[PDB]
Amino acid sequence: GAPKFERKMLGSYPVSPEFEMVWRDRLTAHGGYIQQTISPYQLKFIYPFWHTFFARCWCKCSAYAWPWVWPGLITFGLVKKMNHDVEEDIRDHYWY
Amino acid sequence: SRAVYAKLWASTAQYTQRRHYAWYQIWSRVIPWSVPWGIFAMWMVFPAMPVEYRQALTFGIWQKPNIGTHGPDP
């Protein structure tokens, strides 16, 4: 949950059992904020996914390139070198 | 005075050593519980050992049961 100095409540009404986990993670909104949300019944909800497709795909694929792909190519190459030495070792021992 | 303040600061310099002295005190109170648990363990595995070994740990006291069956063949 949250730290003790954040869990402190301003009100006095008792915490209801269905809300025990909500108030175990209370966090103070330091400085305040203003929130605006639209009803899902009044939004386009598939077009936004494709409108931002190229930007999202660039971000994900760029992050994964070095750390995942570069070790994978090396592992693939080692798999081929291994299989090339096995064949040659079978003929140097059993073939005439 | 600075001399007084120095001695008060140093009073708690050996924290690590005092925690080690705590280890000794507690482990000395706990370690005797190994005897009850040890007796029960040997008590449980005694019948799974060979007859020759069962007579050694008891100084010849223990012997096979005599219930009146499986006697010598004439």
């Binding site: 209801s16 108030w23 400085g31 930007a55 | 050593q17 280890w23």
Partner: protein
């Protein structure tokens, strides 16, 4: 009296430490040995130029680009689940606490969309240590408490008062003290 003899050994080693303790600051001794500090200096011009040097420089570039993409500072990466850092956050003044709150909100939103910030919003140094004065004061407060109160393994009543009895103070945080009530509507420890 076997306990009094062991206590004599502890006491002898204790008095020796005290008699050899300086009364002013003295630099700590070198850790690595002379044999290890000689090989490093001999291989340094080659090891540093081609390996260790570029490793250090790649590391800082990787960190800086990730933080700037999300609008974050390095110190924003520490958690309030650390006792030291939690105490430090309690000591902050309003203006610094508000800016951290806002950066953390914005960075969660950007990571959700997976969209970079524009380059002109990334023109800042993310490695400014804005938490340092409060971290060093927190360490001092908690080191005092531990030395003055936590120098022994204290006994206690077991499974009484909502706690286990082995040192916990906040109730219901271990499985063997889970489920405090069968009937009723329960309650909050923060409303006692």
């Amino acid at each position: 009296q076997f306990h009094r003899e062991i206590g004599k050994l502890f006491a002898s080693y204790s008095n020796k430490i005290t008699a050899n303790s300086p009364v002013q600051y003295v630099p700590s001794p070198p850790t690595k040995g002379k044999v290890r500090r000689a090989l490093s200096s001999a291989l340094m011009p080659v090891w540093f130029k081609f390996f260790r040097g570029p490793l250090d420089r790649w590391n800082l570039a990787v960190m800086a680009k990730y933080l700037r993409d999300h609008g974050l500072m390095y110190d924003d990466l520490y958690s309030d689940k650390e006792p030291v850092f939690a105490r430090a956050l309690e000591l902050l003044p309003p203006d610094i606490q508000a800016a951290r709150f806002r950066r953390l909100m914005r960075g969660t939103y950007l990571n959700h969309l997976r969209l970079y910030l524009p380059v002109h919003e990334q023109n800042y140094d993310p490695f400014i240590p804005y938490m340092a004065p409060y971290v060093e004061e927190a360490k001092f407060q908690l080191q005092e408490e531990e030395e003055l109160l936590g120098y022994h393994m204290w006994e206690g009543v077991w499974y009484s008062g909502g706690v286990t009895g082995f040192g916990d103070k906040e109730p219901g945080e271990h499985f063997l003290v889970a489920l405090p009530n069968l009937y009723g509507a329960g309650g909050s420890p923060m409303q006692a």
